[PDB]
């Protein structure tokens, strides 16, 4: 049975979202690639380079016009006529628009594609812009986080393959399943927050007992993600469990919402 074609493109990025994807524990990224989708274009993993790679791109988007999913990591810069991100000698934004035009739907992976992320933080030297401000005529599912949780990425993929539909989304385009509740609404340190039991300085007696990180700047109270329930790296930890407050990394503009160590 043929597998759904997927085209994965990369704008301005750090590659954290690809790296997250390959961390998936269930299903393994191996089994996603071999059995669930046809990952037909992806610069970070594909054998072909240069003209050979671009022949794949052109062939896939033409052969599967209207039928492929476009995954986008990173974002397009509008500055310098788009030439802060050059793809086959031309602005990345041109490749993005070509790929978008044939896609049935778009997955905006990570805070970069969703919102802008670090390159969009003040003063945004490149005019990095999220996908939904450039592509305005296609379904876009935002999957924010820097990067999103590996098993959240793969769960969204399996949902779409199994159910043959896009996940239901909130008013911002984020899947309700994983982004419907705040980190702080499912945080195992909430008992301490409610009791006024706070870490006041690093490695103090409170920190050694796992007290709440609100006074150390935890942004969990304003952040929507699954970290406090699904956790990271096959359930091993999440930021707060390892003793650092949430940075707010799934939220639009989190880099510019004050110091990470200033209280919400």
């Amino acid at each position: 049975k043929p597998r759904i074609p997927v085209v994965w493109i990369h704008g301005l990025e750090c590659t954290c979202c690809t790296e997250s994807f390959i961390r998936s524990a269930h299903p393994l990224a191996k089994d996603v690639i071999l059995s669930l989708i046809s990952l037909d274009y992806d610069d970070t993993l594909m054998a072909a380079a240069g003209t050979q790679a671009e022949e794949v791109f052109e062939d896939i988007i033409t052969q599967y016009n209207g039928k492929y999913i476009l995954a986008v990591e990173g974002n397009p810069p509008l500055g310098e006529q788009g030439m802060f991100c050059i793809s086959s000698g031309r602005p990345f934004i041109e490749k993005l628009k070509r790929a978008a035009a044939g896609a049935s739907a778009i997955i905006a992976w990570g805070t970069c594609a969703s919102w802008g992320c670090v390159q969009a933080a003040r003063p945004n030297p490149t005019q990095a812009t999220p996908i939904d401000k450039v592509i305005t005529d296609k379904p876009i599912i935002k999957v924010p986080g820097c990067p999103p949780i590996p098993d959240v990425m793969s769960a969204i993929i399996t949902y779409m393959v199994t159910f043959d539909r896009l996940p239901d989304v909130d008013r911002m385009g984020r899947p309700l399943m994983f982004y419907g509740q705040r980190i702080h609404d499912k945080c195992y340190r909430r008992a301490h927050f409610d009791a006024g039991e706070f870490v006041q300085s690093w490695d103090d007696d409170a920190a050694r007992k796992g007290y709440c990180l609100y006074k150390m700047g935890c942004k969990g109270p304003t952040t929507y993600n699954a970290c406090s329930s699904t956790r990271w790296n096959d359930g091993v930890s999440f930021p707060i469990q390892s003793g650092h407050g949430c940075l707010g990394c799934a939220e639009n503009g989190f880099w510019d919402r004050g110091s990470f160590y200033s209280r919400v």
Binding site: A29, T44, R208, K209, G243, F260
Partner: protein, 581 residues
């Protein structure tokens, strides 16, 4: 067309121009152009970083305690290393000393990254340059098992296993949905492995893709998550509690047991899968010990890494040696000083940046990041680069030099430095490896050598994980639990004006962050990153960087199929987001 001489090379842009854009199986965005002569040998090579974000600009005005989180996002492949360099730089500026367990945990973080990054590079990034995946379909599973069993004690070697792998590949290809294998270079004459070795290698590709996810569980324990774990200025945030109430809220014995389990498995995988595979690539591709030398027999650089004495970054402390060699003089390993304005400098006469005088280099405490996209005549337009103009500005990557010399950094550079400083373990490993391949020592200074050194390093790092873990446990047995110093957490305690340097050895080479703080905020933040060195454009003297040099003089079998170019570039493990930041 023009020609000139530099570094023993004749740079000649006559002849056919070939363009490879995008370079794939790297991190980020790169373009490479070459010219070839009538014998299909490269006589000119042009390295171009095709992305820029501007982290050095974004970091201005931030709280120094926040900086690590921003700069960590320079790169999700070498994730964590920029955070480490940042906390080092800010601690150096302010005058903070961290507790011993924090230093040990940071060294664990870095060694974990070396293991993970080198493993994924070998298989997922570089592997398909050496293994003809489609030829694996012709292999005899029994002969594959015999081959595997002759190379290693690794358990997973049955004929049935290799048949199952082969059948999975057959089923995958059969409907034409070749995915990542579409339009590859399969059948190119430079693919020299027999079919059984191709099947073995492909099986290991899949095993590594599965296993790599485990390694980073160490980052999750100490750092919360991977990619992009968390850190603090003053130590680490992962408070320890072994035997008191509330240990459920901290790094406790169960958490430490998890880390030990991962270390053991990581070492087993690297020693019995990656190491024998690297040696086998060497055995079947010996001519590549004479290709892609580049600057590795001329100029190499390491800053050093893994301070074993907390807060001591000197030679007696660093477990990974630092030093520089120039002019092919490996008998005189020179000391490196990152504060000395005559040592590290960056040039932008061939890069898309503005300086007041582009004919001079700037040390990073005097650095300037003022982007200026100005490609000149590129046989198209400013938004259609058909041919970069390497006589003018051609890259988003600045050109670093050391005392005016173009340097190679990374695993081969580090290996050469350690060897020539007389590190006993390195001398013994290198000599045994080259003997086993029946090659002279000079064979290490090559594309093949870069690969062999990286695999060696993954083994070294896996061993060091256990060493560091044992040091942590020793401290805990002695009742030393501290993980953070907070005496100078508050900005009212800091100098009004100060500056500092943070340095380490990332998987790809020498990394430095230079930070200046004023009035509690970052005034200047300049980064010089390993791929910035290696993928460097030219300087005012026309000197070429490591990638351009390594590509020079290379024969191409089939000009339209850049397999030789890919092999050499991939051997350096390019990280373009790192390079440009």
């Amino acid at each position: 067309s023009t020609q000139y001489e530099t570094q023993g090379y004749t740079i000649n842009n006559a002849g056919r121009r070939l363009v490879v854009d995008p370079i794939t199986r790297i991190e980020g965005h790169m373009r490479c152009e070459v010219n070839i002569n009538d014998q299909n040998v490269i006589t000119n090579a042009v390295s171009c970083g095709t992305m820029f974000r501007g982290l050095e600009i974004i970091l201005q005005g931030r709280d120094p305690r926040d900086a690590w989180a921003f700069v960590e996002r320079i790169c999700g492949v070498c994730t964590g290393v920029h955070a480490l360099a940042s906390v080092y730089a800010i601690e150096d500026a302010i005058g903070i000393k961290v507790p011993d367990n924090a230093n040990i945990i940071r060294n664990i973080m870095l060694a974990t990254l070396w293991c993970h990054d080198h493993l994924v590079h070998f298989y997922q990034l570089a592997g398909m340059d050496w293994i003809d995946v489609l030829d694996a379909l012709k292999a005899d599973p029994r002969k594959t098992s015999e081959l595997a069993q002759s190379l290693s004690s690794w358990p997973k070697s049955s004929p049935g296993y290799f048949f199952d792998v082969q059948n999975r590949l057959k089923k995958f290809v059969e409907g034409g949905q070749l995915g990542i294998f579409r339009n590859g270079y399969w059948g190119h004459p430079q693919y020299k492995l027999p079919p059984e070795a191709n099947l073995m290698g492909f099986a290991h590709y899949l095993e590594a893709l599965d296993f790599q996810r485990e390694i980073v569980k160490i980052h999750a324990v100490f750092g919360g998550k991977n990619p992009h774990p968390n850190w603090i200025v003053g130590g680490m945030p992962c408070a320890i509690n072994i035997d008191e109430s509330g240990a459920v809220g901290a790094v406790n014995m169960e958490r430490l047991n998890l880390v030990q389990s991962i270390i053991t498995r990581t070492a087993d995988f690297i020693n019995n899968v990656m190491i024998p595979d690297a040696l086998a690539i060497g055995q079947f591709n010996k001519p590549w010990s004479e290709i892609g030398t580049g600057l590795s027999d001329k100029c190499v650089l390491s800053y050093g890494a893994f301070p074993d004495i907390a807060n001591d970054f000197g030679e007696k402390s660093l477990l990974m040696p630092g030093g520089a060699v120039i002019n092919g003089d490996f008998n005189n390993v020179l000391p490196v000083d990152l504060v000395d304005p005559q040592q590290v400098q960056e040039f932008v006469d061939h890069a898309w940046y503005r300086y007041p005088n582009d004919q001079v280099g700037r040390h990073p405490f005097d650095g300037i990041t003022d982007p200026w996209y100005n490609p000149g005549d590129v046989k198209g337009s400013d938004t259609n680069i058909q041919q970069l103009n390497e006589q003018e500005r051609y890259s988003w990557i600045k050109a670093p030099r050391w005392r005016g010399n173009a340097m190679e950094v990374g695993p081969l550079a580090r290996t050469l430095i350690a060897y020539h400083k007389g590190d006993a373990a390195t001398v013994e490993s290198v000599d045994r490896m080259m003997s086993a391949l029946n090659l002279p020592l000079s064979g290490i200074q090559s594309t093949l050598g870069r690969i062999l050194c990286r695999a060696h390093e993954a083994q070294w790092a896996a061993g060091k994980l256990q060493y560091f873990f044992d040091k942590l446990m020793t401290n805990l047995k002695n009742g030393n639990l501290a993980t953070a110093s907070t005496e100078k957490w508050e900005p009212a305690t800091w100098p009004t004006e100060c500056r500092g340097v943070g340095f380490t050895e990332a998987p790809r080479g020498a990394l430095g962050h230079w930070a200046a703080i004023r009035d509690g905020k970052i005034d200047l933040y300049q980064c010089v990153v390993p791929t910035t060195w290696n993928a460097s454009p030219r300087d005012p003297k026309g000197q070429i960087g490591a990638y351009e040099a390594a590509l020079m003089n290379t024969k191409m079998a089939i000009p339209e199929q850049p397999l030789e170019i890919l092999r050499t570039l991939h051997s350096f493990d390019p990280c373009l987001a790192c390079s440009t930041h």
